[PDB]
Structure formats: C-alpha cells, structure tokens
Design an enzyme around this catalytic site. Structure first.
Site, mmCIF file in Angstrom:
data_model
loop_
_atom_site.group_PDB
_atom_site.id
_atom_site.type_symbol
_atom_site.label_atom_id
_atom_site.label_comp_id
_atom_site.label_asym_id
_atom_site.label_seq_id
_atom_site.Cartn_x
_atom_site.Cartn_y
_atom_site.Cartn_z
ATOM 1 N N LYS A 1 0.814 -1.008 -0.084
ATOM 2 C CA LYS A 1 0.055 0.155 0.112
ATOM 3 C C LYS A 1 0.826 1.489 -0.088
ATOM 4 O O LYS A 1 0.481 2.322 -0.724
ATOM 5 C CB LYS A 1 -0.921 -0.056 1.286
ATOM 6 C CG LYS A 1 -1.798 1.184 1.277
ATOM 7 C CD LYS A 1 -2.747 1.368 2.470
ATOM 8 C CE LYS A 1 -1.942 1.638 3.670
ATOM 9 N NZ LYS A 1 -1.779 3.281 3.814
ATOM 10 N N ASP B 1 4.318 0.267 12.122
ATOM 11 C CA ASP B 1 3.185 -0.572 11.532
ATOM 12 C C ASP B 1 3.197 -1.797 12.028
ATOM 13 O O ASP B 1 1.811 -2.425 11.671
ATOM 14 C CB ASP B 1 3.151 -0.344 9.835
ATOM 15 C CG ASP B 1 2.867 1.334 9.415
ATOM 16 O OD1 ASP B 1 2.159 1.952 10.372
ATOM 17 O OD2 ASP B 1 2.994 1.530 8.408
ATOM 18 N N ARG C 1 -9.113 0.569 4.655
ATOM 19 C CA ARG C 1 -8.452 1.471 4.139
ATOM 20 C C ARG C 1 -6.655 0.776 3.681
ATOM 21 O O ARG C 1 -6.086 1.109 3.077
ATOM 22 C CB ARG C 1 -8.140 2.690 4.803
ATOM 23 C CG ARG C 1 -9.572 3.509 4.746
ATOM 24 C CD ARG C 1 -9.495 4.822 5.698
ATOM 25 N NE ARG C 1 -10.745 5.378 5.445
ATOM 26 C CZ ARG C 1 -11.013 6.576 6.251
ATOM 27 N NH1 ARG C 1 -10.061 6.977 6.958
ATOM 28 N NH2 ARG C 1 -12.222 7.462 5.948
#
Ligand SMILES: C=C(O[C@H]1[C@H](O)[C@@H](CO)O[C@H](OP(=O)(O)OP(=O)(O)OC[C@H]2O[C@@H](n3ccc(=O)[nH]c3=O)[C@H](O)[C@@H]2O)[C@@H]1NC(C)=O)C(=O)O
Length: 419
Positions: free
Chosen positions: A22, A305, A397
């Site tokens: 992403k 993350d 998302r």
C-alpha cells in the site's frame, strides 16, 4: 457501517499471497503525476486508500483505470487542488503537492488537521519544497505552492527521518534544475521502490535506500510499466496471525529482506521460520509465544506499522513483554481495546508493559487505525467466543480483503453490513 463478527479460537494454517505494498503504490501513484506518457503500475492492492488516491488523481484531470494494475494517463492534468473532503480521509493526499508544483508550477492541498495517533505535521514537506524554490502560502486551509519555471536543486538536511518528506522532496527534485541531495533521508523499502519507479520513467536518482539520496533533475519524465514490491506490513501481520494461534503458514509473493527485524523478533517469540527468494514460512508447532521486547524506529529497525500486532503477541505470550514506540508517541489505542478482551498492560509514557495471559475473551471492540486495528481482528481469531469489531472501514483502508485471506487460513469471520 461495516463490522466484523469473528468467532474464536482458531489455529491459523495454510497459504496467503501477499499483495503489493500500500505504502509503495501510494507514492508511486502520486509520482505518476510527473509522467508525460502512459504508465502501468502492476501489483497494486485493492483497498480504500488506493480508491481515494484514484479519486484524487481523477479530480486533477488524470485518466485512471484499474483491474491487478492501475493504468495512469496524466497527459491532460487540468486541475491542481486536493479538496478538504479527500485529504480528511487520507493524509497521504499531501503527496500531490510536490509533483504538481514541479511539473505544472502550481499545486494546492488541504492542510491536514488533527489525528488520533499523535502529532503529524507536514512542516518538512513544506520546508523541502521551499528549499527547492517553491513559494508556499496558506489560504483558507489550503497549502498553496508555486514557482515560476522549474524548481532548483538544493542540498537539504532533514530535521527528522521522514518517509513522507523524503518522498515529497525526491519526487519534486526529478524535474528541478540541477542536483538535489537529501541528507538524513528515510530508508524505507517503499522509498527505494518509488525511486526505482522514477528512474524507470527517466529520472536520475542514486543512494535510494541509504541516508543520502542524490537526484539530478531532467527536463521530462516519460512513461512505462512498473511492478510494486510486496507489502511488508501485510506480510508481518499474517506471520503474527500464525505465531499467536499456534499455527503454520507460508507467505507467497513475499520479500524477506524487507522484514529482518520482524522476523528476528518472531524467532525470539519461538517461531520456526524459513525463507526463500519470494516466500516466508512460519511454524509455531502449536506453542504459545514467548514475550519479546520491541522498539519501533525508522527502517530497517522494527516498524511502527507492526507495533500493535506485536503488542497483541505479547498480550497472549508467556512473560512480560515491553514495547516502546519512538515514531508515533500516542499510538496505543489498541491497548485498552485488547484489555476489554481480558489482556493486562500498563502504558507509561511511550512504552507499554505487557503481562501475557493464557486466553482472551470475545468482546465488542472499536477499530480506529488503518494498520494497527488489524490487531483487533487477529485477537478475535484467537479469543474464546465472539468478538465484534466496529468501524472496520479503517481496516479496509489498509488491507486487501483481510477477511478473505484470514478465512482461507481457517478463520471464522463474517463481514456484517450496517448500510
Ligand atoms: C499509518 C500509516 O503508515 C505510515 C507509517 O506508519 C510511517 C512510519 O513508518 O510512514 C508513513 O507515514 P508518514 O510519511 O506520515 O510518516 P513519517 O513522515 O516518516 O513520520 C515520522 C515522524 O516524523 C514526524 N514528521 C513527519 C513529517 C513532517 O513534515 N514533520 C514531522 O514532524 C511525524 O509526525 C512522525 O512523528 C506511512 N504512511 C504512508 C502513506 O506511507 C498509513 O498507512 O497511513
């Protein structure tokens, strides 16, 4: 509003094919604004952030098509602003700024406001553009950049290691007059990917992946075909899913070298890991994980993350695990949610002290972070009973069909539509 109903406990076993990053697809999509010729970006994940980026691009007059690839034609850009409504749903919108001013001499992006995970200003992006010769003003909440003619290369030393400002400066520099040096540049694999994409278009860049990037500006960028690297965070999330469930998995379409810190931490937790050129295998042998200590920091250190995911691991591990966050100081919302499920932990400053428990219990929890919140879904997979995760749009998302991938591993998960 979508929600996930997860029934646990489940031992995750099987295979998962890793989607494109992403975090590489995003900056590359924005950088395509620089391309005078058609571009084909391969291996782009199907997720909400890509949808928003495609929308933004279209709003600028870019021609966009998608499937596995996203096809971009920026030969007719006719609008130069990213509106409030869009930026509010995606901070990365700020990336339209640099390419617009570098190619067109003008660009406007709604200034991002507050965010739950912590202070996230874009001062470095602005500073970088200014150093390149752009004039920047704030009007009605919009950051407005301009330059008469080409930007000018400059030697810029970064006050913070910043993935986003490094991308903004690097991208815009490809069309500036002269040479730009970015000292104290972020080293993330996504930065290397974006630089390689730029170079495939005709840019002159070296040092990507190191703390010093050098860009020699060119007159124009053309077109081409480029394949986005594998998603390291998606990979780490699946590896953790197996590690906390006593499971066994193989990740296909992976890039082991982007995950060293995570792999080493998984080994410390007791995982049996093997890697190949494009694959990673993990076997827990039915064992509970051992608590580990983690410190987030810029690549190639342990990534923020992966933080929430490892907090979950520690919460069901044997021992006292300690997790310190140095990137996003307030990125701990997942902790009280997990505590609703029976976990035990204390937050002191930027550190969470974990007291692993034998089992979690199903409960109603709330997603709020596009990367971190996947932790709640994972928790639901191993908890006793039913867990309901609200506001899953956040997960949408950042992850491509996470329920489908989990389901293929044996998870009992249902997307419940509220409408
Ligand atoms: C949370 C996400 O992923 C994040 C990932 O956590 C971080 C760190 O690895 O790097 C990207 O964010 P980012 O570019 O905003 O982060 P960075 O710029 O490196 O920020 C690092 C630190 O510097 C600070 N910072 C950054 C830029 C700036 O101008 N000023 C500043 O003070 C931030 O507030 C933070 O404390 C990812 N986002 C994207 C679109 O690539 C997401 O997927 O939206």
């Amino acid at each position: 509003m979508d929600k996930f109903r997860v029934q646990g406990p489940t031992r995750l076993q099987g295979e998962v094919t890793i989607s494109g990053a992403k975090n590489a697809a995003l900056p590359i999509l924005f950088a395509a604004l620089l391309a005078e010729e058609p571009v084909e970006i391969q291996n782009v994940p199907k997720l909400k952030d890509i949808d928003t980026t495609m929308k933004l691009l279209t709003q600028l007059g870019t021609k966009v098509e998608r499937x596995g690839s996203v096809w971009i034609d920026a030969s007719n850009v006719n609008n130069f602003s990213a509106p409030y409504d869009l930026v509010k749903t995606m901070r990365a919108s700020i990336w339209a700024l640099g390419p617009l001013v570098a190619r067109f001499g003008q660009g406007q992006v709604s200034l991002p406001g507050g965010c739950a995970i912590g202070a996230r200003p874009v001062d470095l992006h602005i500073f970088g553009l200014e150093k390149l010769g752009a004039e920047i003003k704030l009007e009605e909440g919009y950051v407005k950049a301009s330059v008469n003619g080409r930007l000018k290369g400059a030697h810029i030393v970064m006050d913070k290691v910043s993935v986003g400002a490094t991308v903004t400066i690097m991208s815009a520099a490809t069309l500036a007059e002269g040479t730009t040096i970015i000292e104290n540049a972020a080293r993330e694999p996504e930065i290397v990917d974006t630089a390689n994409f730029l170079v495939a278009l005709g840019a002159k860049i070296s040092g990507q992946g190191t703390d010093r990037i050098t860009i020699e500006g060119v007159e124009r960028l053309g077109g081409g075909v480029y394949r986005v690297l594998p998603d390291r965070i998606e990979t780490g999330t699946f590896l953790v899913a197996a590690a906390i469930s006593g499971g066994k998995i193989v990740c296909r379409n992976a890039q082991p070298d982007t995950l060293d810190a995570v792999l080493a931490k998984l080994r410390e937790a007791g995982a049996d890991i093997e890697t190949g050129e494009d694959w990673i295998s993990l076997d827990m042998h039915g064992k509970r994980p051992k608590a580990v200590t983690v410190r987030t920091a810029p690549h190639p250190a342990f990534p923020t993350d992966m933080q929430a995911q490892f907090t979950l691991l520690n919460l069901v591990a044997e021992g006292t695990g300690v997790i310190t966050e140095t990137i996003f100081e307030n990125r701990f919302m997942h902790v009280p949610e997990l505590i609703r499920m029976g976990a035990h932990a204390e937050i002191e400053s930027n550190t969470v002290i974990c007291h692993g428990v034998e089992k979690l219990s199903g409960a109603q929890v709330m997603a709020t972070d596009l990367r971190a919140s996947a932790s709640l879904v994972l928790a639901g997979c191993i908890a006793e009973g039913t867990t309901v995760v609200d506001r899953i749009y956040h997960i949408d998302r950042g992850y491509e069909r996470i329920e489908d991938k989990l389901r293929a591993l044996g998870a009992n998960i249902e997307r419940v539509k509220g409408e």
